[PDB]
Design a protein around this nucleic acid. Structure first.
Lengths: 56, 55, 111, 38, 73, 176, 56, 123, 241
RNA sequence: CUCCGAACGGUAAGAGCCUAGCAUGUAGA
């Protein structure tokens, strides 16, 4: 219920996703497709616990 | 069309137009406004479905 | 003549500048050839400014030739400003030209 | 029907009769070999 | 409609939205409207594979955001 | 070889003599089998034999733009730059329609507008048909009169740019 | 591929062999690249006469 | 087809003569149309004579950007040919406009470390 | 079950390698060819180490000879002539433009060529020219998450390379069998022949299973992703009875 | 509701052979 805290975590989760992307490539993808970031661990993905809206 | 001065080097690889254009007050006002009135009433008259080419 | 002299003066026979002030590659070859090509923000900016210039001048040329009248030079100067936004010489050169373009589009909206 | 494999189907129905069958290399058994004439 | 980008190796990058059943011919006509050259003088490829004009987009499987090669014959 | 065929003979109207067509079309025509066979050796009678050999009208075809033999003969004639008498004899020869079309294209390309009109005025009376190649490479049927009227009109043909001087009324008011 | 017996070199393409023909030291012994036009009239006259004679 | 060939040649020559005469008469007709428009604006009818419509080459089919649909311009480089590919009503979501952009937390213009612009077109 | 970044890279390389996900793409890597849209540097070195040697060219050759041997199992019944395994360029499968077909089919006498058709539909149309030849042209293509429709890609590539000049080909007909090694699919869609659809259907089945090239590829991928479950001349050894 | 972005960070690494568009304008005897 603290809206500034809700907004800070959203941009930071996108920031960590950006750091993973700029690690994966070097040229800052136009749209890193959201599956291989936000998908679950045991089925061979990165398992971000994403506390922010992002449409697939 | 009128004309202009021109300053050409003998190399002729450049030609600046030397006449720093020097119109008058109400003269240029009434000129471009005359074009405004004739332009609007020109659109009033013709059905002129035309423009220039892109290139 | 000026920019084509610069282009052929850099020992690069791969590109042929359009006389309507474009630039297009010829052989569909780049990578190594592109790596001595894709450069010179000054050349792209100067080609842009001359492109807007030559669009204006050739517009008045075909005006005083064959379809000048009153429609062509007026509408062409107007869409030449709106196309200084949309067609030619875009923001790839310098920063603030988007601000002058947006002021141009707004002035067009008023008029 | 070895020389004409396109007319053979597993779901095709056919009747039988009491007569002697022709050879494999017979002219009635191979219409494609006799029709190759330009 | 799908948006494509036709960036070149000389600062020539254009963005055009076109529909799905549309062919490469009308798409080259729309690029010609965009970047100020003739439509028959546009050759757009995928690194040595030249996209022929008559075949539609869904056969080449071009999707929204994909980059082409813009060249001139 | 491919640079220039004449050391110092003449010049073009407003460009280089070897650069009358576009540079992309010149680079595409610089690599071909018939173009290499012509650049290995080319004379006036050899150009006449090459014009009498092939009867086709067209430019580049397909995605991989390859030049037509008529375009290769036109490029070799523009590079070699023959005299006006040989071009007038090729335009006046009605035996070979392809050689007459090549001479008409050479006279409309490098010639003056008055000479182009004086050479295209007998060209409008030729009702003989000729083979034409489309942009996709398919063969198309056309006539010599339609190609002469297209060459006497504004430049809309592929790999060709030859503007006129004025209208017919303005040219008639200026001279004959 | 292509073979040049004058230079005894192996050309991998046709343009390499056609180039090795003339435009090289072999051409320098063959008269280099110099070729002129043949007259004006007589070449076109005899060419049109021979072409019309061989045609019909 | 010598007779048909001569007939077609005569047809083409007649068409060319008609085209030249039509260019001359088209200059004359531009003059006459200017004169007729002037006379009509003078004494045709006070808001009682239109005799025309709103003839425009390219269709003006438009829509409405949902919340932040980009100003996708069609490009003013070819507008007189009146081709069918142009009239297609570009008011659709291209890549990112498919979303609603209303349920989002506060606002998301562009998350690419480049929001130098600061506006929403409200003031 | 620098190392683990590479495993993530390959196990999602089919979604992390695409023009849509990197806008300005043009590269063909090497050997067969990979749409490496970027640097994607770890994925690049790994995919070269995945396609270890001349393995792709061998895959094309093994698929071609297997299709020929499957045809050599009904050639007489299909009224062919003989094995028309054509000659090709040395590195010929490493290109993306042309298709000079490996397996022509010199028919015995006047086969009847059908229309353009896909190898899934049944409403064939055998009402056309009486072709002396249909050609079999292989094409292999590493797909993506937005290139994974081999059938549409195949109909496109066949009608394109047929229509354009661009290329030599066989006579009048080249039925282009094409299998996408990424999503293991099978496709051919153009001028089908007289009655060859059942042949090519069972052929694509018998080729996709068990062909030693495809097995070597699947095993190389599994062990990389680490996720387990003239008689005097040499090389001419024969027998003399 | 109409604020439209451009480039670098990106294509390897070389082996033997083959072909090209250019540039200077000299004192000397």
């Amino acid at each position: 219920n603290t809206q500034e805290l809700l907004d800070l975590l959203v941009k930071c989760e996108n920031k960590i996703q950006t750091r993973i992307k700029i690690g994966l490539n070097s040229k800052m993808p136009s749209r890193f497709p959201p599956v291989v970031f936000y998908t679950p661990k045991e089925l061979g993905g990165l398992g971000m616990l994403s506390m922010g809206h992002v449409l697939i | 069309i009128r004309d202009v001065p021109v300053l050409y080097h003998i190399t002729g690889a450049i030609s600046f137009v030397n006449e720093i254009p020097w119109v008058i007050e109400p003269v240029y006002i009434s000129q471009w406004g005359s074009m405004w009135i004739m332009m609007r009433r020109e659109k009033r008259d013709r059905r002129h479905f035309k423009r220039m080419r892109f290139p | 003549n000026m920019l084509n002299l610069l282009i052929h003066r850099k020992n690069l026979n791969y590109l042929h500048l359009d006389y309507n002030f474009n630039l297009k590659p010829v052989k569909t070859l780049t990578t190594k050839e592109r790596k001595k090509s894709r450069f010179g923000n000054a050349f792209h900016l100067c080609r842009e400014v001359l492109r807007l210039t030559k669009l204006v001048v050739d517009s008045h040329v075909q005006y005083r030739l064959g379809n000048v009248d009153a429609f062509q030079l007026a509408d062409g100067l107007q869409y030449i400003f709106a196309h200084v936004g949309q067609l030619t010489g875009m923001y790839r050169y310098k920063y603030k030209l988007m601000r002058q373009i947006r002021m141009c589009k707004d002035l067009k909206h008023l008029i | 029907y070895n020389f004409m494999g396109v007319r053979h189907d597993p779901n095709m129905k056919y009747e039988l009769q009491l007569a002697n069958p022709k050879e494999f290399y017979h002219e009635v058994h191979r219409p494609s070999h006799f029709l190759n004439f330009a | 409609m799908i948006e494509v980008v036709c960036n070149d190796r000389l600062g020539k990058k254009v963005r055009v939205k076109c529909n799905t059943d549309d062919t490469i011919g009308d798409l080259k006509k729309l690029i010609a409207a965009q970047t100020g050259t003739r439509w028959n003088k546009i050759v757009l490829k995928k690194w040595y594979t030249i996209f022929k004009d008559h075949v539609s987009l869904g056969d080449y499987e071009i999707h929204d955001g994909m980059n082409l090669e813009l060249y001139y014959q | 070889m491919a640079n220039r065929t004449v050391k110092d003979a003449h010049s073009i109207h407003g460009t280089n003599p070897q650069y009358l067509v576009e540079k992309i079309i010149r680079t595409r025509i610089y690599e071909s089998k018939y173009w290499k066979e012509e650049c290995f050796g080319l004379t006036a009678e050899l150009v006449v034999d090459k014009a009498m050999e092939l009867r086709f009208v067209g430019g580049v075809y397909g995605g991989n733009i390859k030049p037509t033999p008529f375009l290769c003969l036109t490029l070799k004639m523009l590079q070699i730059q023959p005299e006006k008498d040989i071009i007038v004899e090729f335009i006046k020869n009605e035996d070979f329609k392809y050689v007459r079309m090549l001479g008409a294209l050479y006279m409309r390309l490098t010639g003056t507008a008055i000479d182009c009109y004086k050479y295209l005025e007998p060209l409008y009376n030729d009702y003989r048909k000729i083979k034409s190649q489309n942009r996709n490479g398919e063969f198309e049927l056309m006539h010599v009169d339609e190609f002469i009227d297209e060459l006497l009109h504004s430049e809309r043909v592929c790999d060709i740019i030859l503007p006129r001087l004025q209208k017919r009324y303005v040219l008639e008011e200026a001279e004959q | 591929g292509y073979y040049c017996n004058v230079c005894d070199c192996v050309v991998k393409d046709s343009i390499n062999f056609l180039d090795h023909i003339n435009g090289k030291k072999h051409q320098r012994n063959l008269g280099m690249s110099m070729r002129v036009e043949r007259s004006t009239l007589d070449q076109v006259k005899k060419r049109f006469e021979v072409n019309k004679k061989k045609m019909e | 087809n010598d007779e048909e060939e001569y007939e077609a040649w005569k047809v083409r020559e007649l068409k060319r003569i008609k085209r030249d005469r039509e260019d001359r008469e088209a200059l004359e007709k531009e003059k006459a149309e200017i004169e007729r428009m002037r006379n009509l604006t003078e004494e045709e009818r006070r808001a009682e004579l239109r005799a025309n419509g709103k003839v425009i080459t390219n269709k003006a089919v438009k829509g409405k950007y949902k919340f932040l649909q980009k100003y996708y311009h069609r490009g003013a480089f070819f507008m007189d040919e009146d081709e069918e590919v142009y009239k297609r009503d570009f008011s659709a979501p291209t890549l990112e406009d498919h979303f609603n952009k209303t349920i989002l937390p506060k606002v998301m213009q562009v998350k690419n470390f480049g929001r130098s612009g600061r506006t929403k077109y409200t003031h | 079950w620098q190392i683990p970044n590479r495993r993530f890279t390959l196990w999602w390389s089919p979604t992390i390698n695409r023009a849509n996900v990197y806008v300005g793409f043009q590269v063909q890597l090497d050997l067969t060819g990979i749409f490496m849209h970027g640097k994607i540097p770890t994925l690049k070195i790994s995919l070269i180490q995945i396609f270890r040697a001349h393995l792709w060219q061998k895959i094309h050759e093994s698929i071609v000879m297997d299709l020929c041997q499957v045809f050599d199992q009904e050639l007489d019944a299909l009224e062919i002539e003989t094995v028309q395994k054509e000659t090709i360029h040395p590195r010929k499968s490493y290109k993306m433009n042309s298709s000079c077909a490996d397996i022509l089919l010199f028919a015995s006498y006047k086969w009847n060529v059908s229309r353009p058709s896909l190898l899934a539909d049944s409403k064939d149309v055998m009402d056309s020219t009486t072709t002396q030849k249909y050609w079999i042209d292989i094409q292999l293509r590493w797909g993506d998450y937005d290139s994974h429709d081999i059938e549409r890609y195949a109909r496109a590539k066949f009608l394109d390379y047929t229509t354009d000049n661009m290329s030599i080909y066989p006579s009048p007909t080249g039925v282009l069998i094409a299998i996408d090694l990424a999503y293991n699919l099978h496709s051919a869609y153009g001028n089908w022949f007289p009655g060859s659809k059942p042949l090519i259907q069972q052929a694509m089945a018998k080729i996709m299973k068990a062909n030693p090239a495809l097995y070597v590829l699947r095993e190389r991928i599994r062990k990389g992703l680490q996720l387990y479950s003239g008689e005097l001349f040499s090389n001419q050894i024969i027998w003399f009875v």
